[PDB]
Design a protein around this ligand. Structure first.
Ligand code: FAD
Ligand code: FAD
Ligand code: 4DD
Ligand code: 4DD
Lengths: 340, 341
């Protein structure tokens, strides 16, 4: 059984680890390899704000809510462990701010200590009238990617920096199963018109006095198109743009200003914060996560492909539940081949 | 009106600023000076973990509860301001942990979002089975001392290196009023056997991933004799000793160990944290804060002294209320000389 995972972002590596941890002990031989054209720190995952929080509306697919919950429980469970921080993981509390009353989110009971903000808390944020408090987790993309690659490597999973031109090529080269974790670029290997890029730009800043996340919403502009502040492990992420359809990989002057003055008015102490870097990444926006089997016919055999892409602006939030589901589908593939 | 404040720790500079802001306008010529033999970063204040939280038990002087609350509201009112962090101030959330159920603290409604901990929160901290969550404020001693000294300076308040040897000496040199903010050493200038040193040792550590304060309690060993973790503005403070009666200024090995491994057990990610410094300071422990007027006679003239010392392990938590009370007592000194507000 030769399995090639394509993609070395959170989705690819989490899935690779999940498959391997689950089947190494019971299937000889199992050969899992990762192929990608960019590894940390050059993936969208590396640019992620680094916080666990789903969108404010339910998902179309009710499986996604579960995947989000499994991910939180998976991540929470690590708190107490000596290596939580070396995985990119720590607990944070913070605020969600609104210009008007809004319904509770479906995830209110998944986080810790969810409640509405009292009138007294609201005076800390003059521009907003209603909000939430809760405790969630930081999950730093960059650090988590380094952790997962060390955990994969020690288990004998090999990485190959290479650009896949088609599913065909990889199958022809000896893959029995392909796990497709190519993120926003999946369309290059199989056209998918529902998949769009969600261009997000961020400013990273040294401001270690900030201990809380602060996320504002503007209902008339779409999600994450409103200032947001997320303290990371060593730096702070400043955001406020997320526009679908825009394929420009370069930083832009307007979004820089939108992020900087939006965040400087939210958190005026930002005046003394040193800019550390400024980045742009593309969320794999899709009305729903594509996570499914597909049978491909080349040469003399079927090669099974399992897709796992289209996680929009919530891939870190939802990744573990998605990896588990892919390992399930793999298991079905195995019994069909009378392998276990 | 020549006022000498003795002390440049949080209590001293607080009170100085507060008097000055209240009475500069209505009283020329007001001349406020600060005398001290230790300034930042060599004051007890500089060593303070930097968190707002009173003791778990209510104080013998209930006035201290209001002084804590005035302080919190005062500090809170600055959140939203561009300069909150330059003052040493930022909000933080965190946990108070107990091995058994305990009554709610009197300060539960002064903080933000106080509630009990749920079983799931308790799974983060194995050794413990009851506790609180809340939001409070960091007030870094070292930074707040610097902020206050810039504010005082630009108001024309002048600072002098001086080890005062008696109230007499200062009254002889021309002071009409003396504000005594000498912390744990007040007994040198007037014996006060209720005042004892509360030796506290800490390890400062580079661990910027830790965003929450974590304070454990051991109902039997007395307060702050249990591991505690408090993220500061740039570094993290680790503690766990608070020993009354002990005057040894040097760091010792067995308290280092008590702290380090007590805290490594609580927060095991601390294995990767670089040690940046370890320090020892003496909290001015007293059954209650001394904050009162006293008239002393030296030759022909009366000298007015207002004492403000004995703030134990809660001086930052309570300081603004105390400064405001000293300013009230100053007002009454004024009105006794038929001067007006
Ligand atoms: C600014 C910003 C902030 C965000 N913040 C958060 C957050 O705080 N929390 C959260 O949960 N989510 C966040 N997201 C969303 C999250 O970043 C994404 O959902 C996630 O990173 C996507 O993971 P992925 O592994 O699917 O894609 P990627 O991380 O892009 O990985 C794609 C991989 O596929 C490889 N690849 C693709 N095509 C090929 C090919 N043809 N041949 C070889 N290799 C190929 C690439 O080299 C790369 O290794 C954010 C997104 C942005 C843009
Ligand atoms: C390890 C530790 C951690 C702590 N953490 C916290 C915390 O998180 N929150 C909190 O609220 N409290 C905390 N405390 C308590 C807090 O540090 C004190 O309550 C506070 O610093 C007392 O301030 P002060 O100005 O009264 O005294 P100090 O800061 O000691 O200042 C005293 C001043 O008096 C001067 N002085 C004294 N005698 C003379 C003299 N004869 N002539 C001239 N000058 C003189 C000194 O030079 C100095 O300027 C902590 C204490 C310790 C030991
Ligand atoms: C709060 C996070 N779950 C999303 C943050 C984000 C996503 C896309 C662009 C900027 C920020
Ligand atoms: C939460 C703060 N009030 C810490 C106080 C303190 C006092 C003495 C020793 C260590 C810490």
């Amino acid at each position: 059984m030769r399995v090639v995972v394509i993609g070395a972002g959170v989705i690819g590596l989490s899935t690779a680890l999940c498959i391997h941890e689950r089947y190494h002990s019971v299937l000889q031989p199992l050969d899992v390899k990762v192929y990608a054209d960019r590894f940390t720190p050059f993936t969208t995952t590396d640019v992620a704000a680094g916080l666990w929080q789903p969108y404010t509306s339910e998902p179309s697919n009710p499986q996604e809510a579960n995947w989000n919950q499994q991910t939180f429980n998976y991540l929470l469970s690590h708190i107490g462990s000596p290596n939580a921080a070396n995985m990119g993981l720590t607990p944070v509390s913070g605020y969600n701010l609104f210009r008007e009353a809004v319904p509770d989110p479906y995830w209110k009971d998944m986080v810790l200590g969810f409640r509405k903000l009292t009138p007294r808390e609201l005076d800390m944020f003059p521009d907003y009238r209603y909000g939430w408090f809760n405790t969630s987790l930081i999950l730093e993309g960059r650090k988590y990617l380094q952790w997962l690659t060390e955990r994969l490597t020690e288990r004998g999973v090999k990485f190959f920096l290479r650009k896949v031109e088609s599913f065909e090529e990889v199958a022809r080269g000896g893959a029995d199963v392909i796990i497709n974790c190519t993120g926003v670029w999946a369309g290059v290997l199989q056209p998918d018109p529902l998949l769009q890029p969600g261009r997000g730009q961020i400013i990273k800043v040294d401001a270690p006095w900030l201990k809380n996340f602060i996320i504002t919403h503007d209902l008339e502009r779409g999600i994450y198109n409103s200032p947001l502040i997320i303290p990371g492990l060593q730096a702070v992420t400043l955001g406020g743009t997320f526009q679908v359809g825009n394929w420009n990989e370069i930083n832009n002057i307007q979004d820089h200003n939108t992020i900087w003055e939006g965040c400087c008015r939210l958190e005026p102490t930002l005046k003394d914060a040193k800019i550390v870097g400024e980045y742009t990444g593309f969320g794999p926006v899709r009305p729903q996560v594509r996570l499914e089997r597909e049978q491909l016919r080349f040469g003399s055999s079927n090669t099974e492909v399992i897709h796992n892409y289209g996680h929009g602006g919530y891939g870190l939030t939802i990744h573990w539940g998605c990896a588990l589901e892919v390992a399930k589908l793999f298991g079905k593939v195995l019994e069909e081949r009378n392998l276990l």
